[PDB]
Amino acid sequence: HHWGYGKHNGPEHWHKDFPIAKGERQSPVDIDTHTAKYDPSLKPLSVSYDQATSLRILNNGHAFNVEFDDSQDKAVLKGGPLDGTYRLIQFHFHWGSLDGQGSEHTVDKKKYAAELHLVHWNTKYGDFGKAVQQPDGLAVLGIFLKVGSAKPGLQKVVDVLDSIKTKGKSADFTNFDPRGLLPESLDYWTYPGSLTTPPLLECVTWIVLKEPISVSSEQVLKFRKLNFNGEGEPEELMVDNWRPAQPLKNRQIKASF
Numbered sequence: 098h099h100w101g102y103g104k105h106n107g108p109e110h111w112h113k114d115f116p117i118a119k120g121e122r123q124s125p126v127d128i129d130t131h132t133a134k135y136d137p138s139l140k141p142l143s144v145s146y147d148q149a150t151s152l153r154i155l156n157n158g159h160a161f162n163v164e165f166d167d168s169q170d171k172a173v174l175k176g177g178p179l180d181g182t183y184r185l186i187q188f189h190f191h192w193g194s195l196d197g198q199g200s201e202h203t204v205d206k207k208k209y210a211a212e213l214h215l216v217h218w219n220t221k222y223g224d225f226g227k228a229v230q231q232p233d234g235l236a237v238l239g240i241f242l243k244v245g246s247a248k249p250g251l252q253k254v255v256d257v258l259d260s261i262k263t264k265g266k267s268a269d270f271t272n273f274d275p276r277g278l279l280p281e282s283l284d285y286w287t288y289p290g291s292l293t294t295p296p297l298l299e300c301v302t303w304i305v306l307k308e309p310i311s312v313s314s315e316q317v318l319k320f321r322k323l324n325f326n327g328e329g330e331p332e333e334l335m336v337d338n339w340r341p342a343q344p345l346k347n348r349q350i351k352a353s354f
């Protein structure tokens with residue numbers, strides 16, 4: 098009876114195994130755009146992905162992960178609200194069963210069809226496992242997806258999904274350029290939060306871009322053909338793998354714009 102996204106084991110249950118679920122800096126949150134404070138001291142976000150080395154794509158039973166070589170400063174995030182430098186380790190998405198839901202963060206209560214999370218760890222802590230034990234260990238760049246025109250830079254991801262249909266499948270995934278997943282603008286909101294998945298550790302500086310990307314109905318439908326189950330088990334479609342908005346508590350969301 099492990100955690101997941103169902104009636105039986107979903108977000109409302111997670112606190113029993115992970116009591117930090119009811120903590121002071123949980124994610125995601127609703128971004129109230131009128132209440133977010135413009136902070137003129139925030140810097141532009143520096144996204145340096147030209148040397149990124151993707152390795153592999155994995156169905157981990159909850160979503161799919163595109164993993165990168167993070168054994169040197171290749172692909173890094175810095176600037177914005179961050180001190181020092183954060184290395185890209187992986188990205189993944191959360192998405193819905195319907196185009197009207199799927200994102201984890203919301204904007205004035207609006208849900209997007211999906212949300213991309215690019216996960217980075219603070220190189221001062223040496224490895225990802227040490228970083229997640231620190232309040233400033235991770236920086237996650239979140240990007241909303243709306244359904245409209247296709248995102249050409251997503252199609253390589255879309256096209257490999259049939260090879261990792263079920264939990265625990267993995268495929269070589271080299272030479273993928275994550276720059277093709279970014280919107281035009283790097284304007285952002287930021288706040289201190291958590292992993293949105295168990296173990297829900299309060300280690301993340303969230304940076305959520307204002308501008309969504311557009312993906313086609315066909316691209317998101319292929320996400321929804323993935324399976325949460327392993328091969329040889331009954332099919333349960335990988336949809337609605339998002340945590341809802343959590344209480345903001347004693348936090349301020351800052352805007353770079």
Ligand SMILES: NS(=O)(=O)c1c(F)c(F)c2c(c1F)N(Cc1ccccc1)CCS2(=O)=O
Nearest residue numbers: 159160187189214216235237291292293294
């Ligand atoms: N959502 S998030 O950005 O806070 C988040 C995160 F910051 C992580 F560091 C990691 C997450 C992760 F979600 N996952 C990926 C996942 C997606 C969906 C269901 C389970 C796991 C597992 C691997 S991880 O790299 O440790």
Ligand SMILES: [Zn+2]
Nearest residue numbers: 189191214293
């Ligand atoms: Zn995520």
